[PDB]
Ligand binder design. Structure first.
Ligand code: K
Ligand code: K
Ligand code: K
Ligand code: K
Ligand code: K
Ligand code: K
Ligand code: K
Ligand code: K
Ligand code: K
Ligand code: K
Ligand code: MG
Ligand code: MG
Ligand code: MG
Ligand code: MG
Ligand code: MG
Ligand code: MG
Ligand code: MG
Ligand code: MG
Ligand code: MG
Ligand code: MG
Ligand code: MG
Ligand code: MG
Ligand code: MG
Ligand code: MG
Ligand code: MG
Ligand code: MG
Ligand code: MG
Ligand code: MG
Ligand code: MG
Ligand code: MG
Ligand code: MG
Ligand code: MG
Ligand code: MG
Ligand code: MG
Ligand code: MG
Ligand code: MG
Ligand code: MG
Ligand code: MG
Ligand code: MG
Ligand code: MG
Ligand code: MG
Ligand code: MG
Ligand code: MG
Ligand code: MG
Ligand code: MG
Ligand code: MG
Ligand code: MG
Ligand code: MG
Ligand code: MG
Ligand code: MG
Ligand code: MG
Ligand code: MG
Ligand code: MG
Ligand code: MG
Ligand code: MG
Ligand code: MG
Ligand code: MG
Ligand code: MG
Ligand code: MG
Ligand code: MG
Ligand code: MG
Ligand code: MG
Ligand code: MG
Ligand code: MG
Ligand code: MG
Ligand code: MG
Ligand code: MG
Ligand code: MG
Ligand code: MG
Ligand code: MG
Ligand code: MG
Ligand code: MG
Ligand code: MG
Ligand code: MG
Ligand code: MG
Ligand code: MG
Ligand code: MG
Ligand code: MG
Ligand code: MG
Ligand code: MG
Ligand code: MG
Ligand code: MG
Ligand code: MG
Ligand code: MG
Ligand code: MG
Ligand code: MG
Ligand code: MG
Ligand code: MG
Ligand code: MG
Ligand code: MG
Ligand code: MG
Ligand code: MG
Ligand code: MG
Ligand code: MG
Ligand code: ZN
Lengths: 99, 138, 124, 208, 83, 99
RNA sequence: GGCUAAUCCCCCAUGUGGACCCGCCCCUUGGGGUGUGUCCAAAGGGCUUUGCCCGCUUCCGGAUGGGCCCGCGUCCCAUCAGCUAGUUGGUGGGGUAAUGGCCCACCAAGGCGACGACGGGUAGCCGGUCUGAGAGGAUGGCCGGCCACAGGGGCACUGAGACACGGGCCCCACUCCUACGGGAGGCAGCAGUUAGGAAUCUUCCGCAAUGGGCGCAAGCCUGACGGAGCGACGCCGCUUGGAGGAAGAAGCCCUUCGGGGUGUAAACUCCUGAACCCGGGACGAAACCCCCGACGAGGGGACUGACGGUACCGGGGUAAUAGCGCCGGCCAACUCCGUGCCAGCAGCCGCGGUAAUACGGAGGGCGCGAGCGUUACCCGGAUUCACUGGGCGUAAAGGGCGUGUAGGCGGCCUGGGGCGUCCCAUGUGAAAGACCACGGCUCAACCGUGGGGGAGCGUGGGAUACGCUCAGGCUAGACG
């Protein structure tokens, strides 16, 4: 079974490509707390069909390019910019801690 | 607000029994009531009943104690010697059926929340399901 | 610490510093003496302890103790050293192994011979 | 090693009369019938209250010197017994009693366990017909411990088995004196052994 | 090719062989595909040779090649018997 | 002081010269055909593409241009020729290309 | 420069079939089918010789082996906080068995990072192994799996497969030959030499067994392997005697000078018989092969042992190595003399300056025993990095205070989803090891056979109490 994840499109600034952020909950291996991790996957959008905020399913695919190994299966739900804003604020905080 | 309502109820019961109160009022909730059902069924309390304070619904837990003891400290033996919350917010505890603890080698209970309702260690073990390890009582 | 703190920071494993930096973790090390001096002990004791500043094949030059009643260790004596410190001598963390390459065993030793490099005497 | 040397000095040091020479530990010559104090210059001096480690070590040494088994084999047998299911002490005793030399002693073929060890090592004992010369050999229930047909003419065997006429054997052993053989019927229970040892003391000694 | 041969598993002067299906390019004591029998050359026990006949027939059907010794041991177990 | 496995080396050299030749032909012919397809000379283009495909398969007979890789070269050649003639038209000789 | 053969190379033909362009159908990424067009096949040899055997060619499938891709897991330093130009993506190409920014043209400006990028340091990884009640900590030697490397660096050729340890090329360092022009070489294969080091082996035997390569076979090769050798390095088995033997020799040590101790210990008496000396003397070895049959099934026959005259069996047969540490407390074992803060001991506390159970020797004792000690290292105890399982008023520890970002956590009621959670079924979890049972070397170590396991992850189905999410509602928190 080819892995099928579900995430949020947070970057449509590339050509025929979208950055889908995928979260996952799991108990900590030693401390048992259900912790939440995440990972960004570069998925293939050959029709520019999906835009920012779209929650979409992603499927393991034949490699399209270096770092691009997934295709957008279908659209789970339309643009919800709240998770996108959360990710953008997380990124924007990085400029405040340099020196 | 309360961060853990269930632990709040358990601590209310602990603090009440430690001074030999008659009953204690806990803010009412279906989950708390389902736990109190197991409590009263197992004999740790005389029972519970829904009540109303000035505007809001509560649960009166009627506590249980042993006979008055002799010698110094005639205070009776506690029926609930120990009651501790396990699956707290921030560290939730889930166990399979083969991972349910035998409390006090039998003399205690462990309250679980399973997909088939709120059960005890022996009840869940007989049912064959596991879940969230709410609290241990003995 | 809270569970969330342990997920963020985690417990810190404690590492133990080696009391015997004879490099490569060796149990013994060969060296050549530099000086064979006499050191006075610390607070409660008083004696003349026999110490030798051994220059090791490990690259170090450290002082090591010369056990036994008598010794024969000149300046250019080649001796082997082992762990084990002398408490009443600050800085002396190593012992000379008696019976190795220049250091004869303590003569007339009869009780604990293997610890001072003295072979079994002849017929009884 | 086998500790080989004086033995009745252990009869003295352990405080309990041991039987390491066979006879002469029954005769008024054991040096325990006449000198019950431990050996050495300081044997007759007033004893101090022994530590708990002292008590457990003395009891374990008593039980170990009774059989003449070295520390290596002793600790190995004990760990083997602790691995098994059941009471560690009784199983350990059943293991020690299952040794071929000890069985030869118990069957009256030899007067002492060390004499039995020499009888085994010199191939004078057979197990189920086949010759066996290992004291550490473990006898199973049902094994027939016999005397070699070529050794049944020896003077010592004649003496020992001529004295065994009329003597009873352990409840877990059978003896045929005419055929000069016997059978290990079962493992001995704790109630079958009259050893002056507290097994729990040895268990606690190795528990450290 | 895939072969059916013996592997040595006993100790020194105590040889015990596993009749085994493995790639010829692998070492004789290395990772085999399946153990299809065992062989004791010194005949220490009354059962000193056992072979799974159906499995040997399968591996021969798919294209395995046994050694001369392996083929002898199989023939003794009636792998090729068609009576 | 060495063993006669040097013989193998010798053989490789021969085979090397055998391979480099065939490929050097194929490549050459391919280019030639493509030229005629760019200039519209369809008859000669297909007539040379036939010979190119033949040399490709003949090289595939041995260890020179084995595997498919030969089919890959044939595919790319036929595709490029048919595409370049479509910019002009009139597939005159009707050679390798299907109707 | 010249001659020549082939299972060497080439051309044409035959098109079972396959390859490719295009079209159609099914299927859904480049899978399968179909039509026209085009393109592609081959090698002979041996006999028991016109019939078989070893082969050859094209195609489909199996089997085995592998390539590539993806989820999750994989040490320390944040006294490394910003990294990135083939960088991220696209289009079109080149390349490969195959995807890919692998490579290259052109276009777009992206990609990664406190959920720790980048940098630095360290390190093959795992099955396992050691320890631990467990959780965990430590480790990855032998054996098995995967990786990487072959003096350092780079590169292609040949091939089903290599960027090739005992193949090739170039640069560098090194060694050797040298007619000074130029060449040869690569133990991290077995053994051995040397250097370093506290320290690690024979320049041994054998193709008999197992396995591998070539060959129809005979057979050839195999420092793979099977054995032997050396080293108490480890584990296991065994010996240095057994029984009798004085109110108790001598010597030696204490002493109230009565005696006490070494101690049944010895000498001795009787008995067995480690070593050795003879004789017998293996299993491992029945296949390939040959004959019959049918070169099949089946039957029969013959050859072959390095270990090795070893194991083992029988007879004969001598009382025949014991050492090392400790004895103030922790910690089992005490006296005498010598020494006089000297000489020395010591893991920690500590002992020695006149009468030391602590130094040194003696007698005696305790502990282990072909070992005993020491040093080094790991886990343990250590609940002393505390998930299980700790703390912060005065013992080490609440930030000087606030505002607040991310993050963590979230009152009551109903419903949808089923992400966490839970259940069932199933796949996976190589072997070895670990556990249990039986069995083979006289036991054991060692080994064989069988049994049982197991988290995690994949898939199918199910549960909805709790946590999650979405939709709605409430007012006890909060705000007004
Ligand atoms: K845990
Ligand atoms: K930035
Ligand atoms: K056709
Ligand atoms: K090579
Ligand atoms: K045959
Ligand atoms: K004999
Ligand atoms: K005899
Ligand atoms: K002096
Ligand atoms: K002393
Ligand atoms: K402060
Ligand atoms: Mg998401
Ligand atoms: Mg876009
Ligand atoms: Mg692309
Ligand atoms: Mg689970
Ligand atoms: Mg000198
Ligand atoms: Mg037990
Ligand atoms: Mg046990
Ligand atoms: Mg392989
Ligand atoms: Mg059979
Ligand atoms: Mg068949
Ligand atoms: Mg060659
Ligand atoms: Mg050749
Ligand atoms: Mg050209
Ligand atoms: Mg090629
Ligand atoms: Mg010529
Ligand atoms: Mg056709
Ligand atoms: Mg043709
Ligand atoms: Mg050819
Ligand atoms: Mg021809
Ligand atoms: Mg003919
Ligand atoms: Mg790149
Ligand atoms: Mg491309
Ligand atoms: Mg392409
Ligand atoms: Mg290639
Ligand atoms: Mg990057
Ligand atoms: Mg992350
Ligand atoms: Mg490294
Ligand atoms: Mg354990
Ligand atoms: Mg563990
Ligand atoms: Mg590791
Ligand atoms: Mg390795
Ligand atoms: Mg390995
Ligand atoms: Mg080298
Ligand atoms: Mg090189
Ligand atoms: Mg190189
Ligand atoms: Mg080839
Ligand atoms: Mg390589
Ligand atoms: Mg190379
Ligand atoms: Mg080489
Ligand atoms: Mg060369
Ligand atoms: Mg040297
Ligand atoms: Mg060797
Ligand atoms: Mg040879
Ligand atoms: Mg061979
Ligand atoms: Mg062979
Ligand atoms: Mg070998
Ligand atoms: Mg031993
Ligand atoms: Mg005696
Ligand atoms: Mg005699
Ligand atoms: Mg035979
Ligand atoms: Mg042969
Ligand atoms: Mg014939
Ligand atoms: Mg036959
Ligand atoms: Mg021979
Ligand atoms: Mg004999
Ligand atoms: Mg003491
Ligand atoms: Mg000392
Ligand atoms: Mg130490
Ligand atoms: Mg004096
Ligand atoms: Mg004195
Ligand atoms: Mg003293
Ligand atoms: Mg002494
Ligand atoms: Mg040791
Ligand atoms: Mg430690
Ligand atoms: Mg710990
Ligand atoms: Mg603990
Ligand atoms: Mg610490
Ligand atoms: Mg804690
Ligand atoms: Mg603390
Ligand atoms: Mg403050
Ligand atoms: Mg938040
Ligand atoms: Mg917030
Ligand atoms: Mg809630
Ligand atoms: Mg939330
Ligand atoms: Mg619901
Ligand atoms: Mg679910
Ligand atoms: Mg296993
Ligand atoms: Mg374990
Ligand atoms: Mg057995
Ligand atoms: Mg299971
Ligand atoms: Mg499911
Ligand atoms: Mg439901
Ligand atoms: Mg709401
Ligand atoms: Mg107000
Ligand atoms: Zn006695």
């Amino acid at each position: 079974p080819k892995k099928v994840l579900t995430g949020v499109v947070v970057s449509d600034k590339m050509q025929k490509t979208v950055t889908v952020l995928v979260e996952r909950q799991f108990p900590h291996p030693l401390y048992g707390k259900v912790i939440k991790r995440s990972k960004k996957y570069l998925a293939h959008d050959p029709e520019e069909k999906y835009k920012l905020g779209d929650v979409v399913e992603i499927i393991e695919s034949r490699p399209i390019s270096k770092r691009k190994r997934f295709r957008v299966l279908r659209l789970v739900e339309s643009g919800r910019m709240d998770l996108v804003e959360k990710y953008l604020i997380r990124r924007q905080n990085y400029e405040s801690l340099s020196k | 607000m309360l961060t853990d309502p269930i632990a709040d109820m358990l601590t209310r019961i602990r603090n009440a029994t430690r001074v030999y109160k008659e009953s204690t009022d806990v803010p009412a909730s279906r989950f708390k009531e389902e736990i109190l059902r197991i409590l009263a069924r197992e004999g740790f309390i005389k029972g519970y009943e829904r009540v109303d304070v000035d505007g809001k619904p509560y649960l009166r837990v009627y506590l249980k104690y042993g006979p008055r003891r002799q010698g110094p400290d005639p205070r009776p033996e506690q029926v609930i010697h120990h009651i501790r919350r396990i699956s707290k917010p921030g560290r939730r505890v889930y166990v399979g059926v083969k991972e349910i603890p035998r409390v006090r080698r039998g003399l205690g209970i462990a309250i679980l929340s399973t997909s088939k309702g709120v059960l005890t260690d022996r009840e869940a073990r007989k049912l064959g399901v596991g879940g969230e390890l709410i609290c241990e009582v003995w | 610490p809270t569970i969330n703190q342990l997920v963020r920071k985690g417990r810190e494993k404690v590492r133990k510093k080696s009391k015997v930096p004879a490099l490569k973790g060796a149990p013994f090390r060969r060296g050549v003496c530099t000086v064979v001096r006499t050191v006075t002990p610390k607070k409660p004791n008083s004696a003349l302890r026999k110490v030798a500043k051994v220059r090791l094949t490990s690259g170090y030059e450290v002082t090591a103790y010369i056990p036994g009643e008598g010794h024969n260790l000149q300046e250019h004596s080649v001796v082997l050293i082992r762990g084990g410190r002398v408490k009443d001598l600050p800085g002396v963390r190593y012992h000379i192994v008696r019976g190795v390459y220049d250091a004869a065993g303590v003569k007339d030793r009869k009780k604990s011979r293997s610890k001072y490099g003295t072979k079994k005497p002849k017929e009884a | 090693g086998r500790y080989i040397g004086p033995v009745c000095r252990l009869c003295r040091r352990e405080g309990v009369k041991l039987y390491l020479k066979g006879e002469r530990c029954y005769s008024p010559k054991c040096a325990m019938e006449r000198r019950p104090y431990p050996p050495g210059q300081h044997g007759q001096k007033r004893a101090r209250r022994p530590s708990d480690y002292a008590v457990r070590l003395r009891e374990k040494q008593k039980l170990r010197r009774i059989y003449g088994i070295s520390e290596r084999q002793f600790r190995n047998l004990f760990e083997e017994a602790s691995k098994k299911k059941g009471v560690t002490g009784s199983v350990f005793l059943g293991l020690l009693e299952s040794r071929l030399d000890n069985v030869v002693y118990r069957l009256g073929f030899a007067v002492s366990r060390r004499q039995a060890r020499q009888l085994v090592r010199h191939g004078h004992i057979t197990v189920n017909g086949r010759r066996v010369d290992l004291p550490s050999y473990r006898v199973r229930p049902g094994d027939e411990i016999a005397v070699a047909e070529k050794s049944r003419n020896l003077e010592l065997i004649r003496q020992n088995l001529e004295a065994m006429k009329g003597r009873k054997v352990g409840p877990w052993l059978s003896l045929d004196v005419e055929g000069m053989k016997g059978k290990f019927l079962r493992l001995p229970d704790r109630e079958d052994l009259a050893l002056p040892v507290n097994e729990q003391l040895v268990i606690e000694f190795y528990s450290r | 090719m895939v072969k059916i041969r013996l592997a040595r598993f006993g100790s020194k002067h105590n040889p015990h062989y596993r009749i085994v299906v493995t790639d010829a390019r692998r070492k004789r004591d290395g990772k085999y595909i399946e153990k299809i029998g065992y062989y004791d050359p010194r005949k220490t026990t009354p059962d000193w040779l056992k072979v799974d006949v159906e499995r040997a027939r399968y591996w021969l059907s798919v294209g395995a090649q046994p050694t001369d010794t392996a083929r002898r041991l199989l023939r003794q177990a009636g792998v090729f018997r068609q009576e | 002081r060495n063993l006669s496995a040097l013989k193998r080396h010798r053989q490789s050299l021969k085979r090397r010269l055998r391979n480099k030749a065939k490929k050097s032909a194929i490549k050459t012919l391919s280019k030639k055909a493509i030229q005629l397809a760019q200039e519209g000379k369809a008859e000669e283009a297909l007539k040379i593409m036939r010979k190119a495909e033949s040399l490709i398969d003949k090289a595939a007979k041995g260890s020179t241009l084995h595997k498919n890789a030969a089919a890959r070269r044939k595919s790319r050649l036929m595709r490029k020729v048919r595409q370049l003639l479509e910019a002009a038209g009139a597939p005159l000789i009707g050679g390798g290309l299907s109707a």
